[PDB]
């Protein structure tokens, strides 16, 4: 028997090469069945061919096989809560994928490795079925049918070694529950080893801080109950007993700071032992060392316990390193910013000695810019020597700014064509910009306001602004209530403190008016302006060109502006007419915003946001109306319309139209109006105060990925607006808008989606304290950057 020809069957990656490698014989060598055995074992070793038939036609070999490779495809059916990526982890963990193991015998292993996953999850009550759609020449689609009935259930956990304490009271801090409350009808009833470990360590910490050093754990035993429901636990422990702190015997390496080092360790006798306090104090010492700056100095305490009286003398040893490792830094995340834009804030610099406080404060001011997404950094030890350290501020930068457009329903023309745009670090520069306007068929408007916050090295903030509100009843320009105006406001901002800044500068403005409508406080102010036109028609005109001095103060001790969580910021702004100008007054305003986190989980948080404002004439004068405060608009207050709050318009019988479509217009003698026509439409006022109190709401059920990029709350908001220059002389016989007593109020929700297109919020609420006709909508939308 000598092989004359071999049919080297084997395909889809291999050829005659691998089979001939399998065979020991060429054409003209004695043939055997050791080739059969070697081929089968080698093909189970490699795992290509499920079987071999090395047969011989006389003395002519032939190879007939089946193949474990290609798995053409996979399907997953019934994987309710488990997602196919974790299934893929199980699969690659099995080394199983396309072009891999086969042999349906292995299904038990596969299902086992599936069961294992559930066996690890917390379940055991389930199974899986793999099914083969056979496909030609080797191939197979593997569909997986997941019989996932239900996981087992937590029942009751008992512990013994608890005389000083109830069990439930200490249970109360755990993730897990042997029973749900009713004031929280929802609540998990699941299992996890990790949460269990945390509860264990939590108990350990509890009995540490109540002083029990002889506390331990002996063990803990889970009930693995038939029928696949019952998980109790029984826990074995030492209660021990508390000790009492008696003394401290710290030592170590100090660099002569021993005084202040002790000043950390200053304590009262009779206070109980608590290793939490110990850890706290240790960390405080670490921080102190960071102040002078020491990278990796060692700490270690020693509780020298006296069991004769249950007390301890706490020795400590310490190992200070060295200082001024400050070689360099790095930054990562910058694809748009410029390096200087960081370093300007970095109170630390390269080539220095260290202070970690500097670095913390750098992160703080950084985030307080609110010009990024995520923040972190590492104090990367330098490998050249144990004497230098570099830093990397490997972080992320936000794409932001926003073009403004769109508004609630209204006229066919008059709900669009409105500009408004922000970059605020324009072109990745830190130059900050806001530009707006609107074209309409009854007015037009332009305004630009731009600042370089860092004209100089110091954070010198050079800001300038102009406007041209070309309002003349645009595209009519005749016999209509024109107020065309245009002016300038240009100032500076001074870094005063690490958290506090000032503002000071000037403005110079011109106004121009025509065909003014008889209204009451209008002519009040104007008779204070010393101009006494008629009170009947709208054939009237008036202009000004004035100067002013503006200024303000700002506090900001805060976390960020992306989605702030803790701290507060306030913007005070005052301004005044100057001497020599036409008009004489001041206007002063102040907007506060405070964030208080409940936990440092940074998910249940309080907001207090308010505005307080007042301005008034000088020289016994009245301010021009158009500088009045305003309110509502779902950007300061919601559940109302913008500028639709406070004292309101009041009308005379009008004696002048220069039109008559059908006299669609209100209150004229030409229409047939007398008997002074009170009205509803709003005007603004001189005095304002508003308040807002909100609970941050964690999101209902959202992916962390973008839930970190979304914010929400409920609120209760209210406020009010009024005049003092109101009277009762002829105001009588009307609703007197004098006093801050028609107080407006509502409450609702806030829904802050962060798109890449700017910040966007929809909103709902409901008015409660409504007064004389005031419009509103609860379902509202907006894009502005209000607080």
């Amino acid at each position: 028997f000598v092989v004359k020809d071999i049919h080297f069957e084997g395909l889809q990656r291999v050829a005659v090469g691998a089979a001939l490698l399998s065979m020991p014989v060429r054409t003209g060598d004695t043939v055997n069945d050791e080739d059969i055995s070697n081929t089968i074992r080698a093909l189970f070793a490699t795992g290509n061919f499920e079987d071999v038939r090395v047969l011989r036609d006389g003395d002519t070999l032939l190879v007939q096989v089946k193949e474990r490779p290609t798995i053409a495809s996979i399907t997953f059916s019934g994987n309710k809560s488990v997602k196919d990526d974790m299934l893929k982890q199980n699969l690659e963990a099995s080394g199983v994928r396309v072009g891999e193991s086969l042999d349906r015998t292995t299904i038990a292993d596969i299902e086992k490795g599936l069961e294992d996953f559930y066996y690890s999850v917390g379940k055991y009550s389930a199974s899986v079925k793999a099914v083969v759609t056979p496909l030609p020449r080797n191939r197979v689609d593997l569909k997986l049918v997941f019989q996932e009935g239900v996981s087992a259930e937590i029942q009751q956990i008992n512990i013994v070694g608890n005389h000083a304490f109830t069990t439930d009271e200490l249970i109360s801090h755990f993730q897990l529950r042997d029973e749900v409350p009713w004031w929280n009808v929802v609540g998990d009833r699941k299992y996890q080893k990790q949460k269990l470990a945390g509860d264990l360590e939590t108990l350990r910490s509890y009995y540490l801080d109540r002083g029990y050093a002889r506390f331990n754990i002996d063990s803990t035993q889970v009930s693995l109950t038939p029928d696949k429901k019952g998980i109790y636990v029984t826990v074995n422990i030492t209660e021990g007993d508390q000790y009492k702190l008696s003394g401290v015997e710290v030592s170590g390496n100090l660099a002569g700071h021993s005084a202040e080092i002790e000043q950390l360790t200053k304590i009262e006798p009779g206070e109980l032992y608590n290793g939490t306090k110990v850890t706290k104090m240790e960390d405080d010492i670490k921080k102190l060392l960071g102040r002078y700056g020491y990278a990796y100095p060692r700490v270690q305490s020693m509780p020298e316990i006296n069991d004769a009286d249950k007390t301890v003398k706490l020795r400590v040893n310490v190992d200070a390193g060295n200082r001024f490792y400050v070689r360099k830094i790095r930054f990562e995340g910058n694809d748009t910013s410029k390096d200087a834009v960081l370093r300007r804030e970095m109170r630390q610099m390269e080539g220095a000695w260290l202070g970690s406080d500097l670095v913390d404060q750098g992160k703080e001011r950084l985030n307080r810019l609110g010009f990024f997404e995520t923040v972190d950094t590492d104090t990367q030890r330098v490998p050249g020597s144990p004497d230098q350290v570099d830093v990397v501020y490997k972080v992320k930068e936000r794409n932001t700014g926003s073009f403004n457009f769109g508004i609630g329903y209204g006229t066919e023309s008059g709900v669009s064509f409105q500009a408004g745009v922000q970059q605020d670090n324009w072109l990745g520069t830190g130059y900050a910009v806001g530009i707006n306007g609107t074209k309409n068929d009854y007015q037009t408007y332009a305004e630009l306001s731009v600042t370089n916050p860092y004209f100089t090295v110091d954070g010198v903030s050079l800001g300038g602004r102009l406007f041209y509100n070309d309002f003349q009843a645009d595209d009519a320009d005749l016999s209509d209530y024109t107020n065309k105006s245009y002016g300038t406001d240009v100032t500076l901002g001074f870094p005063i403190n690490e958290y506090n800044s000032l503002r000071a500068g000037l403005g110079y403005v011109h106004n121009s008016l025509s065909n003014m409508q008889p209204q009451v406080a209008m002519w009040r102010y104007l008779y204070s302006m010393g101009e006494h036109p008629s009170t009947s028609d709208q054939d009237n005109s008036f202009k000004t060109d004035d100067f002013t001095f503006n200024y303000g103060w700002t506090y900001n001790k805060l976390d960020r502006g992306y989605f702030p969580t803790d701290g507060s910021r306030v913007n005070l702004t005052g301004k005044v007419t100057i001497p020599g100008s036409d008009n004489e007054y001041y206007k002063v305003t102040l907007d506060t915003a405070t964030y208080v986190p409940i936990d440092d989980d940074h998910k249940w948080v309080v907001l207090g946001r308010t505005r307080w404002g007042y301005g008034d004439g000088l020289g016994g004068k009245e301010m021009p109306f158009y500088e009045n405060f305003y309110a509502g608009g779902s950007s300061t207050v919601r559940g109302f319309q913008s500028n639709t709050i406070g004292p309101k318009a009041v009308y005379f019988p009008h004696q002048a139209s220069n039109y008559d479509p059908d006299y669609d217009y209100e209150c004229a003698t030409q229409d047939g109006a007398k008997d002074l026509c009170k009205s509803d439409d709003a005007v603004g006022g001189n005095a304002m105060a508003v308040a807002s109190l909100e609970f941050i709401t964690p999101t209902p059920f959202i992916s962390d990925k973008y839930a970190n990029s979304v914010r929400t709350s409920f609120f209760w908001d209210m406020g009010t607006v009024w005049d003092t220059n109101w009277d009762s002389s002829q105001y009588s016989g009307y609703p007197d808008y004098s006093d801050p007593s028609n107080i407006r109020m509502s409450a609702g929700i806030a829904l802050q989606w962060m798109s890449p297109l700017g910040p966007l919020v929809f909103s709902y609420a409901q008015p409660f304290k409504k007064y004389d006709g005031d419009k509103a909508e609860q379902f509202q939308f907006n894009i502005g950057k209000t607080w």
Partner: antibody
Amino acid sequence: QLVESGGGLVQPGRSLKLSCVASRFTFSNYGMNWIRQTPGKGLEWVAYIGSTSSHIYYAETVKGRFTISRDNAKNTLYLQMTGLRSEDTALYYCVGHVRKLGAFFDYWGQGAMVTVSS
Amino acid sequence: DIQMTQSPASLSASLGETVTIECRASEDIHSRLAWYQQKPGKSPQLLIYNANSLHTGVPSRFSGSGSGTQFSLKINSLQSEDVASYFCLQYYNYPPYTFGAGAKLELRR
């Protein structure tokens, strides 16, 4: 306080410029008027000018023939009377208005009588 | 236009008695009247603003009453020096101005 300067006698149809000066008041921010009283107890408001030159009102009897102006720098009110008739002869008062309340006068001069006659 | 009706043109009364001077308005003005007193050979002076409010440094005796249809001035325990001619004035219609005829206060001896 309110000093007036004007014509004695002129012929109907001629022109005449009266001046009126304020001494102890600012003269700014004050609405100013010219009001004539004819012997015979007929009181007539003839003119009003605002603190600025934006709103000027004349009587329907007077019409544009007369011109009322003010100079804050010189604290002077200027009245030009053109197109003059015998009826125009009257006691002419330089009158002020009331700040911060409006809708009525506060100050009147002694009054300067003009008598036109051929 | 507006009619400042004032009657009687000339009045007279003794010292110590009160007087009610009627002033009637044609268009039922919503209380927008002013009272001015012109004594003989003197510049006219302000008596009442707002149609009921007395001017600074003036005795309380003078009072303003009535509505747009009709107003009245009350002087209580009038003294010898108050003899003057008193007029009404409306400011409700600003463009034009109508005065009263002047009420001439005499005394009774």
